[PDB]
Structure formats: C-alpha cells, structure tokens
Amino acid sequence: MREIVHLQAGQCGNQIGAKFWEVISDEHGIDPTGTYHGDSDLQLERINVYYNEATGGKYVPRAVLVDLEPGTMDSVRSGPFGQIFRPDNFVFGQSGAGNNWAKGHYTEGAELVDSVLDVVRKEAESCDCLQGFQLTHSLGGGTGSGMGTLLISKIREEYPDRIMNTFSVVPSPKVSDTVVEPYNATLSVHQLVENTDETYCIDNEALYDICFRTLKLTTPTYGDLNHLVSATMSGVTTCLRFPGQLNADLRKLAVNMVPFPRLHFFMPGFAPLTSRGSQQYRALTVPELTQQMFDAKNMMAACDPRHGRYLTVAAVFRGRMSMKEVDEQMLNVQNKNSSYFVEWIPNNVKTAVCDIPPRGLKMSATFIGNSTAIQELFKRISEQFTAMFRRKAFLHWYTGEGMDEMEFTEAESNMNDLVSEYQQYQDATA
Amino acid sequence: MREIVHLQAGQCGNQIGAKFWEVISDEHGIDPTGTYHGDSDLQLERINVYYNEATGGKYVPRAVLVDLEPGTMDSVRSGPFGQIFRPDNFVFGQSGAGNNWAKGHYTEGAELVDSVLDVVRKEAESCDCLQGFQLTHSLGGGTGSGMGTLLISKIREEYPDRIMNTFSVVPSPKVSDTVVEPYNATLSVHQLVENTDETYCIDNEALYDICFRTLKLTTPTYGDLNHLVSATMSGVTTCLRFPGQLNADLRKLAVNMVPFPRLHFFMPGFAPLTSRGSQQYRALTVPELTQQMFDAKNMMAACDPRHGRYLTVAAVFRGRMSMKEVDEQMLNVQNKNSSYFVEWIPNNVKTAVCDIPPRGLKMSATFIGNSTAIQELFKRISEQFTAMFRRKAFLHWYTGEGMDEMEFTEAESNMNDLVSEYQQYQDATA
Amino acid sequence: MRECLSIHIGQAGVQMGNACWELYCLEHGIQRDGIVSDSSFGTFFSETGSGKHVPRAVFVDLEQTVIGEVRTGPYRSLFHPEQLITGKEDAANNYARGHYTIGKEIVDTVMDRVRKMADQCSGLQGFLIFHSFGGGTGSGFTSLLMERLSVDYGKKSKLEFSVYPAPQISTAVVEPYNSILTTHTTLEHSDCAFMVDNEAIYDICNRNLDIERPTYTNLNRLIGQIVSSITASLRFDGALNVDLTEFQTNLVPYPRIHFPLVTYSPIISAEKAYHEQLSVPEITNACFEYSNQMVKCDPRRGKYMACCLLYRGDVVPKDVNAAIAAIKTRRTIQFVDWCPTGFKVGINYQPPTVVPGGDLAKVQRAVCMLSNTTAIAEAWARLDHKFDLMYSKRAFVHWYVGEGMEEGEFSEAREDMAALEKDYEEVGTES
Amino acid sequence: MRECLSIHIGQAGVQMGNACWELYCLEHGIQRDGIVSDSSFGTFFSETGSGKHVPRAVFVDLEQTVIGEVRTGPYRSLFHPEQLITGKEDAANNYARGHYTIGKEIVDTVMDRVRKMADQCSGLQGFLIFHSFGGGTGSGFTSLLMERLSVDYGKKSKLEFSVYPAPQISTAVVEPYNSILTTHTTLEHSDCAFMVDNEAIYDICNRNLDIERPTYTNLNRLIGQIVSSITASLRFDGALNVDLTEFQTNLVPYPRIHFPLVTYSPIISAEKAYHEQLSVPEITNACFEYSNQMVKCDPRRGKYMACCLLYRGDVVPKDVNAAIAAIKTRRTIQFVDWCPTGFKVGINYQPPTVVPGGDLAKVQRAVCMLSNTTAIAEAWARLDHKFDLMYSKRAFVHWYVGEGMEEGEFSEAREDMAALEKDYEEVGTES
C-alpha cells in the first residue's frame, strides 16, 4: 500500500505534529494507547499509510520527532497521545539552537543529522511502497529552518524519486516572534526552492484572523491554530487513506499544481469554518463551501490572492458529494473570477472527492492554490533581509558558526530570482 | 422563484424592519426561533421570496441591517424576533452619524460601505432570480439619509437592471424631530431622484392622525405606527408571496405607476382601519374599502391629494374578492372624482387582487398614488432649505466632513427642477 | 377532421385554458386524473398508450405563479410536465419585455414543444391561441409566437381568443400601448380573432344570470362554452358540420378584417329557466340583441358582414332556416349591401354539458354566434384615441424604449392602426 | 458470434466496468455471487465447469484504491482474482508515467492474462477497452495495451469507450497534454472509439432525467446501457443482427476517422414516463437532437458521415424504415454528399432491463445511435487550442520529460493531431 513517513522538527513542527496525530488517530479510531476501537472497517483498509502495526493490535505511527533540545519533545511524552509514538523515534539533542539557521544546519544539528537518518531509514524499509516524506517546521526558527533543510537535502540525495511535502509556517507580515527571522527565512527558502517538490505556506497572522472573525473564538491558543493546520494536512492525504469517486494522491496534486519546478510554494485553505453561533444559520452544501474556500478571508497565508493571479488550484472534497455540483461550482468560479487565473493555462482547477468526511462533519473541502501573489511574501522577506544585511545587523552570530558572508548574498540572489520568475508568468501572451 | 433582499438603515429603518419581519413571519407561520409552524401549505409555496431555508427547517430572512452605531441594532437582538436574523448580517459600526448627511455619506459611512456590500452580494448570489432590493430609512436622519443614498448609488451601479424600492419616512410639515432635516432631505432626494425606481413617502404626522381619528388609539407608540407602515409594505409584495386572480409584482407596479422617470415618488394607503368601537358598526365590503383608500384622511402623506391631481393610482386587494365589485368601485371613483386625474392619461387605476387576506382580516387593500400634490412636500423642504442656506445656518458641520458648498446649490437646483417638472404635467392639453 | 392545437399564453389565457380544458374533459368523460372512465376526442387529446389522455396544449407564461397553480391543482396529472413552460420574471405589463428582452429567451423552448406536438398529428387543422389583448406576456409573447408559427406553418389556421380592453373598465394604465402594439404584429399573421370584453361579460352575469358576485372563475367558465361551440363540429357529428377552416373562409371577406365578436344563447339561471320555453327562435333572437353580445360595442350602431350561427343540441334544421329568415327581414338589423348572403349555419347533435357548481342552467338546446360587424370599429377608435392622448406627451415610452425597442415603432403601430379604421369605413359604404 | 473481451483501465474505466458488469449479470440473470440462478451469455462469460460464470474481463490499474473496492465489494466472488491486476503507485495524471516508467513494469502481467483469456475462446470478435481520455493510467497505459494488442491480434476488432474531456468542465490541469498524447498513439491502432463527455451526460441527467443530485454512479450506470445496446446483437437474437465487426466496416469511411459519438433514447424518469407514448418515431427523433447526444459538440454545426441505429425491444421493422425515411428528408439534418447511404439499421428482440434503484424508467422500446459526424472536429480543435496555449511556455513539460520521454514527442503529437483536424475538413467538402 502507499505509505508516508512523517518528520517534525523544532517546537513548531513537533507541536503541530502532536495535534496532527490526534486528528489522524481519531479518524481511524485508535485509542491513545495505540489500540484500535473504531466502528467502521474502512478505517483499517489503509491504516498502513501512517501506522505500523505492532503485536496485539497496537498501531504505532511512523513519525520521526527531531528537536535539538529535549524541552518540547518532553511535553509530547506527557501529552494525551504521548504513549503512541515509538520511544526510539524521539531523536532529541541537548544544546538547542539559538534561533540561528547556522547552528541548526552546520554546527549542532550536523552532529545529530546522522542519528535521525538511522530512524528514518528503518521506517522507509518498513514500508512496502514508500510514496514520500512530510516535514513540519517553521521557517523563522533555528532548529526547524536549520535542521529541516539539512534533513531535506540529505534525504533528497537518498530518495530522489520519492516526494517530500513541507508544511512550513512562514513569518507573518506585521507581527514577528523572532528578531532574526529574515536571515533564517531567506537561507531556508534557498534550500527549499530546489530540494522540495511542494510546500504549504502557513502564517500565524492569517490563522489568528480566521479564529477572530471566521470562527468567533475569543481566546485562541496554539491548541486551536494547530487544529486548522492539521485539518488541512489531513485533507491533502485523504485519498490515500480512504476511497472516493475521484482520487488524488500526493503525486497527483504535485504534477497538476506545479507548472514550473521552482514555483512550488502554495497557500492552503479549509472549509467549512463556522462559529457555533452562526452554525445554525448556514446551510451545508457544495455551493456554500466553494465560495468560502476561494474567499481571500479564509486563506491561511497573509498574501491577498486578489493582488495576483492563480496558476493552478486544487480543491479536495470529502464526505458524501454530488459531482455535478462540484463541477458546476468550479465552473462558476472559473468564469466569475475571470481575471484571477493566468490565461496561458486553459483550466486551473484540479478536483478530487473522498467518500469519508472528517470528524463529525458531513462534508468538507481543502483548498490548495499556487497563486503568484505569494511573490509578495518573498518580496517582503528580501526587503527585510537587505535592511539588516546592508550593515551586518546580526551577521556575527552566523559567521561564528562556520557560515561565510558569501552564502548570504548567494541566498539573497537566489531569492531575488524566484520573485523575478514569479513576476514573469504574471504577464499574459496577449 | 422571484426573490427580494431587504435593507434597513438607521434607527427608523431598523425599527420599521423589526416590525415588518414580525408581520411577514406571522403570515407565513414562522416561529420566532425560525421554525415553521403554519397550517396552510400555501405559505411555503413562495417562502423563498423573503427567507433562505437553513438546515432543520430554520428559515432565515435575507435582511441586511445597517447602522453606524450599535445602539438600535442591539435592541433588535433582544427583541421578540431577534433570534431569526443571521448574526453576520448585523453590519454595525461604532461612531454613529451626528444627524448630518455628510458624515453618513462621505466620512464614516464610506468606511462601512464596503462591509455592507459583502453581505448583500452573498444574499444576491443565494437567490436564483433576484427581482429587486428594498430600503427602509428616514430622509431626516443622518445615517439613513447618508448611508441609504450611498448604498443606493453603489448597488445601482452593480444591479442596474434590477428594481429598488425605498420606503422612506419624510419630514412632517408642522412638527419636526431634527433641526437640520432640510439639509439632509434635500441632499437625500437629490440622490433618490435619479437612482431609485419607486419611493413610498411616509410621514409621522399623517400616521399620528390616522391613529387619532381613524383608529381611536389614545396612546400610539412607534410599536403602532410601524405596524401600519409594515402592513402597506406587506401589501405591495403580496402577489409575489401568494397567488391571486390578477397579480402584480414589483416591476408591474413601477411600470404602471411611473409615467416619467423622475416622477417616481408615491404616497401609500391602507384599508380597512377601524377602531374596535366602530368595528361592529361597519360592514366589510369592497365598496366600503374603496371609499376609505381614496379618502384624503387615510393617506400616509401630509400632502392633501385634493390640492393636486393623480397621474397613476394602484390598489392592491387581498383576500376573497369579487372582480365585478372591484371594477365597479374603481369605475365609480374614476367618474365621481372627475377632476382628480390628469386627462392625458385615459385610465389611471392599476388593479391587483390576491387570494390570501392579511392576519385575521377577511379582506384588505393597499393604496398607492402618484399624485402631483407631492410637489407641495418638496416645495416646503426647498423653502426651509433656502431659509437656512441663505446665511449658512448649519453649513460648517457639512463642510467640515469634506462636502463643498457647490453641492448644496446643485442639490437645490436639482430639487427645484423636480417641482417645475411636476407643475408642468399638472396642466392639461385643453 | 384532426388535431387543433391550443396555446394558452399569459395569466388571462392560462386561467381561461383551465376553464376550457375542465370543460373538454367533462364532455368526453375524461376524469381529472387523465383516465378515460370514443373516436372523436383525438382532436384535442393524445392517447398515451396506456388509457391516459394528455391534452394537446402548450401553457406558456413568464411568471411561475399562474402555472404553479396548475402544477399543484387538481389537473396536475392531466398535463404533460414539459408542456407547462414557465419563465423566471414576468413581463411587468410591458410589451417590449414580453417581445424583445424576456420573450426572446423562452420563445425557442415553446417552439420546440409545438413542433413535437404537431408531429404526432395525422392532420393539423390549426392553432387556438388564448391571450389577453392588454398585458405584457399575453400581448408581447403572442406576437412572437404568431410570427414564429407563421413562418413554420404558413396557410394553417391560427385562431385566437383575445380579451379586448373594455371601453370603460380597465385594470392597467398602459393597455392602449400594449393593445395597439400587438394588433400591429398580429394583423398580418393571425387568421381571425374572437373578441371578448370583461365588462360585457360582467353585464351578462348580472342581467341574464342572477349572480351578484361574479368572479373570473365565472367569466372564464362562461368563455369556455364559446370555444366548445366553435370546436364541437370537429369533436362531434351532426348535420352541417363546420370545420375549423370554414371560419376564415366565411367570416373574413378581406385579409385585414378578421375580428368577429362573440355571442352565446341561452344564458339563464336555473330558477329563471323554469319560466322559459327556450325554443329555437327564442334563443336565436337573443344572439342579435345588444343585451347579450360579449363585446360592449353596440351592434345596432353598425352593419354586419358575416355571421356563423353554431347551433347545438336537440335542434331541427327547418326551424333554423325559419328563424334565420325572420332575422334577415328585420329593418333594424342591417347587412352590408355587397354581401347578399351573410349567414353560415352550423348544426351539431351533442348538447352543451352542465359544469357542476356552475351558474348556467341545463339547456337541451343552445346557439353560439360569431359575427363580423363594422360596429367593432367603435372599439378600435377608442383605443386609438386613448393612445395618442398619452403618446403626445410620452406618458410611458421610456419603459418600452429601454427594453430594446425603438420609438419609431410606436409611430408605425398607430399608422397601421389608423389604416385599419379606414378599412372598416370603406367596407361599410356602398353606392 | 463468440467472445468479445473487455479491458477496463483506470479509475474511470473500472468504475464504468462495475456498472457495465452489474448490467450484464442482471440481463442474463447471473446472481452477484456468480451463480446462474441460456446459450448466449458465453460472449462475455466463461462457465467454470461448476455453474459459476466468470466475466471475460481484465481490470487493470496502477493504484490499488479502485480495484480494492471491487475486491471488497459485492462482486468480489464474481471476478477471477488474477484478472484484477493492480499496481503499486498511481500514474499521478502523468501520461509519461503511465506509458514509460510505471506502465512498462505491469504491461507484461496484463498481456499474460489477455492471452489466457483469448485462448479459451472458439471465436474472438474483438476487445472492448474502457478508459478515460484524460488521465495518467487511463490514457498512458491504454496506449501501451493498444500497441501490444495490435502486434499480437492484428485485424481483430479493438473497440474503445473513451471519456473525452468536456469542453467546459475539467477535473485536471494537464488533460490537454494527456488527451492529445494518447490520441497520437491510438489513432493508428484503434479501430473505432465511442466518445462520451461528462458534461454532456450531466446535462441529460438534469433535463431529461429529473435527478438534481447525479453522481458518477449515475453517469456510469447510464453509460453502461450504451455498451449493452452495442453488444446486444452478439448476446441476443433478432432481425438485422449487427455483429461487432460491422461497426468498423460501416462507421469508419477512412482509417483515421473512427470517433463516433454516443446517443441513447429514451432517457426519461418514472413519473415523466406516464405522459409519453414512446413510439418508434418518438424515440428515434430524439436521437438526432442536440439535447440528447452524449458529447457536448453540437451535431447541427456539422454533417454526418454514418449512423447505426441499434433498435431494441418491441419494435417493428416497418416503423424503423418510415422513421428513418422521415429523418433523411429533413433539410436541417445534413448528410455528406459522398455517402448517399448513411444509416446502418439494427434490431434486437430483448428489451432493455431495469436496474433496481436506478433513475431510468422501464421502457419496452429503446434505441441507441452511433454516429460519425464532422461536428466532432469542434472538440479536437478546442483540445488543440488548449495544448499549444500551454506548450508555448512549457507549462508542465518538465514532469513528462523526467519520466523517460523526449520533448520532440510533444511536437509530433500535435502535428499528427493537426493533420486529423485537416482530414475532417477534407471529408466535409464536396464539389
């Protein structure tokens, strides 16, 4: 069967993974101890996708949890679903990265890179037909950006044919969490822009907005944001886990979504998102879901899609569906928003439908869009990068870890090319 | 099915709407929670006209409630029928208009105009065949006159083909509620005179008179006046909601009623209106209703119709009826009141009959008249306008919001043309 | 004698149609569910290979309200669902909307049904068209169908029943525009039109009938008997059968004069029936009195050009000749000089049936008259006077213009109407 | 008349196959467990010496998901386990993967089964191939099978049912590449292809059928009736039997023009059936209307080159000739000059069966039309326009190139496609 191995690096990656496996395990009816207590036989039909079956019906997820400091991973052990992961997969270091890409990529993480590969290789061999790898991390952090890219380069060299998805949290436009994010992001993107096949950019600012207005949640915590990220993460892999009328695995999404190899940065979305107050007043039908997913107010990226054009779009539905409604609504969006798609691609929507809905919902959809508006995100990071690097604001920390200043300009130049390439295709033949 | 979306702006509009939806929901047998508990199957036949059906039989009216200050809308939430409207349609601002047209049209309301259009567009898309929009507001207020006209201009630019009715409360001749009404009314009319297809002028002075003598109500509150306004509002749209022998939708009324595009200001009326003391002593027959509707004592506008002539008249009956009686009585009014109709229109009455009567009544009728006497109303407002603007009585408040004095004279000149046009057609060919 | 197709357009036509088809089903004994609990009901019905008979009609309207009643009414099972064509937005009493903007969208759907209906006919006598002369859909869309039908079915009978605006009663302000515009577009295409006024029928219900509370369920029910008399010859056997095409050959001397008025006798209540013999002369003499004709125009004010007395029931041909002979010798009744022979007799054996709950009494003998009289010119003139009285000041022209129609069309319409008035003057005078 | 072999490739083909085989079992009365609770079911079934009948099909896919449903579905016992061939990794909507990289690995396994299936046939009429024109496996692997089958089984009929990309609806971004590439590799090898569009069938489900919530269980179920009509002659007796090879001899004038479109009549709901006679002319006239054809291309926009009316049920040969004669005299319906005779009649006695729970009504009389019309050129042109619009900028070529395919193949594919468009132009004009 098709199989995936999950990698989570850093505080952001590990905490997202913890919520992600809570959602995945709940759908397949897995007890926190690892036992199976589901009701439908269709859950075990593809449980091999994520879980290795151990003796006694104890299903063990094949996830590799990496963090240069024990702190974050220690809480995962004591969490509600801590006792499901294999103890040996917790590859934790001691000296945590100081939020600098250099330490997590060259000095400290380089010592732990070999240990992680040992766990991953065992998982890859445990599979019968491995499809691809998944990485959850943040581009603004040290370990995630550093260790994540170091892992990506190494595994790519060892699994060139397979796929690797990257659910990466991206720095927010207005409010930042770390001072030196521009250096980490620019360097990290320089690695992802050539080593990963698809990326799912997410930013906390957009997720905060969704909770504030789209969900009317007064006190949102990371126990809430990570659920939306997990929900989108589960949607992308639903076809692998469950049957449907029109399926789309990870490879199918990548081929349709990526026109050119370097333009593989996407922006996800989810529907339906309704507050309990407004739940009663809204009808749950395909037409309603289509409007929300294409609404700029629901995108999980700060960049407003209306400021640019769509190269490719993918909507993965779940639950009982009507194919005619799906096609009609996609036809409406294609025509109504005439100028939001590049003409040189006659049709931009790749659809997929799964029979099983998520959790208690009777219907859901996950949105993926390869908009050119994301060029704005890279534009801002480069502007911030040049603002600091112009006079070496924080460069002595990176140079002291073995990095050379020539690398920063190479990353800057490579990043500038990506924006130029994006701008080129925003033009039209006529 | 034919569908309408309701807009209510300001304290006057919102409070009229609240009573309006109580009447509409009661006729269709809708529980205050939104559930349907009616007895006749004919109520749901056209419930799509006003209500969007949600899951569980909970019908949600597609009304947009706009007010620059939360105050008035807050009471609507706590009202008897507060829990029927969709929460997201309550587009309320914070800084309420200071009873000046400028603030509600240029500075404050202009910031909230975009938000309102988002709600309206969703409603318009929810319809299968949208007919037109309805606006309830007051011409003497700030938000209603300001925001209402700003909405009208915007939606007209976006829905030129469709219809837009405006049930506008007009300043009373003798007693006013606001000092600066003349400025707001003149500016507001300058927008309505070219952007709306039909208007239903109402004044509190006439409604107070109806309660005092025609209904013998000792203590009339706005809980009473808004019912008469709602009753007329329901009558105009009865044919859409229910069948009849001779139907007349909103478009049919406008085409018959409006000879010339700028003369689209009407004066409504209702029958039967009888006090409980006099209810026993009066017979309820078509001949009795016809006399009252054409009685100047029952008009909902201060202007006395006998001071002018009728260009077109429309009487929409409801309940079990006899077509012969309707035609005979209309023939009597046509001949008896020979000089009350302009000759250059051979016949001025457009009739319509609906099978279902309103509330517990077995028979009712709604009167609409495009009299030239309404020129008197515009004449008074212009006289008051020139009295103040002659020396800039309150002009610094309007000029401080971005308005230019040239706009006031343009509105004054445009208003003066309307009176001149009305006076022209009051003449006869011979 | 084979199929005649009925097209019911507008609220007036449809509401007349359900009254007519209710009458047709009772005559042939077809239950309200379409089951036939023998060889002559094929003119207006098609046998659905199962004992279920479908009416050969196309019901068209631009508003779902009227046709929605039929879909939910007792005769829901009777009609083919595809025949009940309905639009989205009404014509709003605007001729331009019903013809150009909203009419053009749904015209093709109607013609698709008509062609399928026509193909299943061994013989197609013609089309019946029920519509209101004044109104948006009933006058704008019918003009489209008349033009569309003419090109496809040239030289096939196209009969129409029109609710002419009453001289005194009116239920809409822009009827003169709507009525004159439709006349211009149907004069060349229509074969002949049977004119009925609501005011005239109201008068009959009060004087002849004893109903003090008539409704459109009464006018339409009475108007239904007119069509039944006209098509009885096709659906029943009897001496002097009158086919559908005999009307246009007899009642239309000139192509532009094809507006016969309607008259029906007897029309008496149940109580008043006991005190009347209702012999052939008694009913016949009523048809030529002003008090019974269904158009308020006074026949005595003009001259006749042709008449077709469609006798029905237990009637004797000799009495018909004697009664007709008595009429022709009247000095008050005048027939135009250039038409020595004016009457077109027609006799049928099937008596009129009694509609349960109706206001009309059971009569074993009835007569229906279709007459082409110059007195109808007094009705066109009032319409012409009511038109220029408004068009001089452009009373409502902006509504019509905005819907894709040119102002010049108004001028052409009246000019054509003006000639029609002149034609009646020319035919009404002889050396 | 002996075996015809059905190969179902891809998610579309397999999901169509289970609908088709569900239909086959009911017609012959084979239960869902393969037991036969008489002499004509041998064309598509093999008797397993025990009263258990195995379908003569090979189900191939590169992903276990779709075939896994069949293995766990109600028809798990029906199919031979070795026939249900499945791969490891899907083709990912990539033609190159389905043809070169992952297709080459599993092609041999399929051919091994086909040879064993073929050997147990006294006579092998040909192969049926169900696939989606747009998609990785359904378009890349079928090209491999067509090439492999041709070398082994030259001059044996190879029929294929293809889901042509809808002109307006699309469910994948790289369909123009996938669809054009497969056309190039199947034009020389395939005998003829029956084209169906998802959008066209969606329209029928809404207008003809009253289903407001259609699903692929409805399209495939309706599409299954098309194949049943085509192969009824093999499986049943009746006047004017039409063997499998008569299609290629009649519907393919030139080797490169072998893409007939599909049409089926009647398609009516149970409620709407009561109001229709459904005589031979009624159903026949529907097949030639734009509103019923299963490809959204408008037939009226072009000319016909051949047609095969596969009548079925209680039908009379005389009515077939009369109905066909009426069609040929229509001026709107045009047949190319160089083909004086266009129709290929075929009549069968077995009426269509009713699938329980289906949206189609019970009809004692049905007709299926296969027509080769030049109007289909309007479908290839849109595909050609959608191809160069992307290939000029190399929209997705990197994915295809990396899978062992050369860029030059793209140029050759369009050049061959361009000639095909020219061919339809040449055949559509006469002096």
Ligand SMILES: Nc1nc2c(ncn2[C@@H]2O[C@H](COP(=O)(O)OP(=O)(O)OP(=O)(O)O)[C@@H](O)[C@H]2O)c(=O)[nH]1
């Ligand atoms: N005799 C009779 N006349 C009717 C009936 N219904 C409507 N009318 C006449 O129709 C005239 C107005 O035109 P309508 O037929 O009602 O309007 P319409 O045909 O639906 O066209 P629209 O303007 O689109 O509504 C009125 O003056 C009525 O006299 C009816 O049931 N019986």
Ligand SMILES: Nc1nc2c(ncn2[C@@H]2O[C@H](COP(=O)(O)OP(=O)(O)OP(=O)(O)O)[C@@H](O)[C@H]2O)c(=O)[nH]1
């Ligand atoms: N009519 C019909 N069409 C289908 C069905 N399933 C898939 N399709 C069509 O198939 C097209 C895409 O190709 P698929 O057949 O789904 O993909 P595939 O054949 O499995 O090949 P892969 O790319 O490897 O998945 C879609 O556009 C659908 O229109 C079905 O059940 N019925």
Ligand SMILES: Nc1nc2c(ncn2[C@@H]2O[C@H](COP(=O)(O)OP(=O)(O)O)[C@@H](O)[C@H]2O)c(=O)[nH]1
């Ligand atoms: N969405 C989300 N983002 C997080 C979470 N925890 C941390 N982050 C982000 O992670 C960034 C800090 O990088 P971090 O991963 O903690 O550093 P690292 O441990 O060296 O990889 C901050 O900008 C946060 O926005 C979480 O639970 N959810």
Ligand SMILES: Nc1nc2c(ncn2[C@@H]2O[C@H](COP(=O)(O)OP(=O)(O)O)[C@@H](O)[C@H]2O)c(=O)[nH]1
């Ligand atoms: N008929 C009626 N008129 C009202 C009601 N409430 C307020 N008004 C009128 O509204 C006018 C004041 O304008 P208002 O709408 O309150 O100001 P706004 O909130 O800025 O739109 C006064 O002249 C009142 O006559 C009501 O309940 N019924």
Ligand SMILES: [Mg+2]
């Ligand atoms: Mg109407």
Ligand SMILES: [Mg+2]
């Ligand atoms: Mg597949």
